[PDB]
Amino acid sequence: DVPLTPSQFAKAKSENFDKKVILSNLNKPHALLWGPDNQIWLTERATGKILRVNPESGSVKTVFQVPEIVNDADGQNGLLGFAFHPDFKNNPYIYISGTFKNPKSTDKALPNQTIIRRYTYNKSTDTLEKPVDLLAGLPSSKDHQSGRLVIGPDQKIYYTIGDQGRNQLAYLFLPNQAQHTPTQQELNGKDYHTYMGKVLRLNLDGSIPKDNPSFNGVVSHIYTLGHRNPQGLAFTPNGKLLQSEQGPNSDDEINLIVKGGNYGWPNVAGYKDDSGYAYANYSAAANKSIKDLAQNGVKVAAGVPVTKESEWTGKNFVPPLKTLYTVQDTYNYNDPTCGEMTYICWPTVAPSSAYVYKGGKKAITGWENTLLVPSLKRGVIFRIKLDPTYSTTYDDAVPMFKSNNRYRDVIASPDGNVLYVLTDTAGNVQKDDGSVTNTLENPGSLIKFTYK
Template sequence: MKKTALSLALGLIMSTSIFSKAGDKFDTQQAEPFIGKVLVEGLQSPWDMAIDRNGQLWVTEVGGNILLVDAETGKHQIIHHFDDVVNGGQQQGLLGLTLDPDFLSGKGENVLYAAYAYKGKEGQAHTKIVKLTLDKAARKVEKTETVLDNLASFTDHQGGRLRLGQDGKLYYTIGNQGANQYSRTCYADRAQRLPTQQEVDNKDFAAYEGKTLRFNIDGSIPEDNPVINGVRSHVYTYGHRNPQGIVFVGDKLFQEEQGPGSDDEVNLLEAGANYGWPHVAGYPDNQNYVYTSYATAEKCNTLPETIGDTKFETSGGAAPNKMVAQKETDFKQEENYRNPLKTFFTVRNGHNMFDPNCSDSSYLCWPTAALSSIAYYPKDGKVKEWRNSILVSGLKSGGIYRMPLNGNSDDVQGELYKHFTSPSRYRNVEVNQDGSKIYVMTDTAGASLGLDGKQNMQMQNSGAILVFEAK
């Protein structure tokens, strides 16, 4: 069990960077084994990135474009556009992308998979997983096939990460769709709801919200998927809030997940495991979080949208409209319950959630990092001190957090390090095969914490890919 206590800031070793215009190089302000440059900027809400066997970058833009970016020059071209994409902002549109292991190998077809939002026949947005087959040069899409569709889609807590495992299965994260807060205060959180056999047979995927899915490349359910509550479905794990990143380390699957007002998480995913949300945020320690199901409140539509905000979760006051606020220890933990490996960050009850430095946007100063992606720095990577580490990107304070793994690569250990800090929002981090380059993608717009710890609305590098190369 690894709790990162923000109030103490112990073990959080930081380095900062000042970025410049595209093409310019710079050194980090504190000693780092990397030198960085802005590879390209001005991309339109870039979201996911994959590195092919030639070291080139495949990038998704939320508005529906798949880009091929030259990893040396930053020059890029549109390889494909989804005409039916629903662009709902940073969390809805074209999101996840993953390459087949034989992509550009010459052994077979050049195949990639993508996840994007589209509008169904009834006018409601859904998510679709598609298989794209490209020509021999991988410059043109020749065939598009639907793998899985009618999955949930919303503008908040979408999840959206898609990865192909070494087992040949596709893994996809779905968030809780913004349930139980703000505009969806009266929308029930389904992260603990499991599908019935009838729903699976009817391809009714409503219960897939707040889950990690695992499925064959044709969209069917693998025979070795876990049986949960008597049903085998696409569900691999459940009890998630907003899981935006997954990465394989060998056969082990790590995930990062955004918490509410505290307790972002890094998890080791196990088949059939329950990670506790919405009953537990971080650890079941009754600190800085209580759960109230507003959707079941009397006259829920009379509640203010801010009722699901951390203001109430940490106040300890009486729940409104005859609701009951549940402590984390009220949740019955079954044998399949799992705690996170690391939290960002654990604080005690009474923590000041209204820092005057973030008066207009108090959430920026909450004890979270707004984790957005996860990557692995390999055991044989070029930089010795970084080897066998998990990297996660943060949206709120523009940084890459590094966590060394143990010898078995199944748990984090030692100190937490923060690198490449800037006022930008880091959307995604990827590491090339030999660890000589780390690529970081930034949001086009949004709020973040500046280097002075105050609210910042100006991105240092908007819609950019930054590359950090080992010295």
């Protein structure tokens, strides 16, 4: 899609809803879920706290605190994955992912690991107990962790693991592993370094599903590859898997996840169109004094190999259903109106999640078959229509609830007339007038929007 302007974003006020702050000043609230107990559950990424809010009374309880979660003040690491077992009454488990110290680490630049872990809910004590590590030794870094964890209708864990920020900023010269897959030797040795920029599919005990796809003949936990920062993952009622992912200066994506599909990153951003992006591989640069011009590979400094999207030799490439946004080679990536925070002016929205609207007895008129996608850098929640079979999008991404807030997650109540949203504690956002602010209207909040 074509970018909306700052004035088009500012007009998305959503006057048909009443706003109410439920909780404020949470410490990096991250995942939000409607619980099997009809209460709202949420996580704090920084502390490892798991919270439960009563939707009728607003009271909150710290149900459990995941011990030894590692979070850097300048990092996107900490407590990430969060999901209930789908048959909770008959299977009382909570599945999480988190950043923990790796005692075997030799590399001081990468001291941590990611672990997918199960907890059992104890109703008599109203807390979590009996931790079970399902999959450990997963890559960890300060950037592009992703970590969305869902249980599919096939009763398998689906888990997004980002590209770890390789080929940009502090990890500029590290070789991106999104296209890489494990050898049989690495898999046998539990060497999961290639589990970067993937959607994993695991058995509920953490083992490899016997029906997982193969890559170079190897059947590992990998379900799809070629992802950058997929922070959104959601099943539709008819069993399709929708996803949102942050692109670089352009081409954030809405994807349809298909078994064994290659989503093209870093060789391809968005469509394979050679429009506004090219792959500049800094890990293959002449030396580390080379600068990243931050022109999305359209223009590069001397000494860095660069390839067109159309020149990539990859197989099973799956294009996105929608891009937010695609631009031409003439686009200006050096907009001074954003000051030092140049990235805020880039033609992207930074999707933080993806939620399939289920409807209900008080459903909002015209919201059937929609996907809701919160935006961090624009301070809007997008509404994306699909056809009833979730095979294609219909029309464009409609912005809603414009505010000077970084929207982190969204859910709706069972009746469908109330939306609940999480907002970041701190960071940069685009104001109504297109400039940048770090003065957030509702830092670290749980906000309620009731249809009127």
